[PDB]
Amino acid sequence: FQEPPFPDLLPPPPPPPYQRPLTLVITLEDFLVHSEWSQKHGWRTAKRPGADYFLGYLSQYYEIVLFSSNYMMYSDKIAEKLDPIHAFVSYNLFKEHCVYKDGVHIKDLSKLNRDLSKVIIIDTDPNSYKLQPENAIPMEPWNGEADDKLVRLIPFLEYLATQQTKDVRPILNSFEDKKNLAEEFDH
Ligand SMILES: [Mg+2]
């Protein structure tokens, strides 16, 4: 284990040519997986349609940080079905790494030791990015039904990485509602 200082959560990015143009921070529950209890089956957990492709494909443009909103043991339990694909994640973070202020657990992007102009967070609770909403792409919580909402995020995210932009924050502010970002991306 080689890791961060003072008291930044991530070690420094590798130098070019290995550095990715951008850092993508994503949450775990109600985004990649969904867990539920029924009488017929146990506690079962499901992986979203396209999760494997999503992580594998975007890893070529992004340093992918899986920042769970859950404590680590619970996170590990419901993330089990992500095992064969999990190696494409660069770093793992958990609720233990959030900051507590105003009765809210916040993923404070400034503690990531990353240039904030080069960082995107996708999450299902706006409080998780309460300190840096200008970096955020909101998603409504996944309830377990098959969809392709995940994969449809890719063309815009792929666009950002292959377009030399020196800041990602003014571009997200150029949408007048980020909840329809994927299709608003259609001219
Ligand atoms: Mg799948």
Author numbering: 171 to 357
Show me the paper's own sentences about this structure:
After passing through the TOM complex, preproteins with N-terminal targeting presequences are received by Tim50, an essential member of the TIM23 complex, in the intermembrane space. The IMS domain of Tim50 interacts with the N-terminal IMS domain of Tim23 to deliver the preproteins to Tim23. Tim50 also functions as a hub protein to interact with other TIM23 complex members such as Tim21 to regulate the opening and closure of the Tim23 transmembrane channel. The crystal structure of Tim50(164–361) contains a large groove as a putative binding site for the presequences and a protruding β-hairpin.
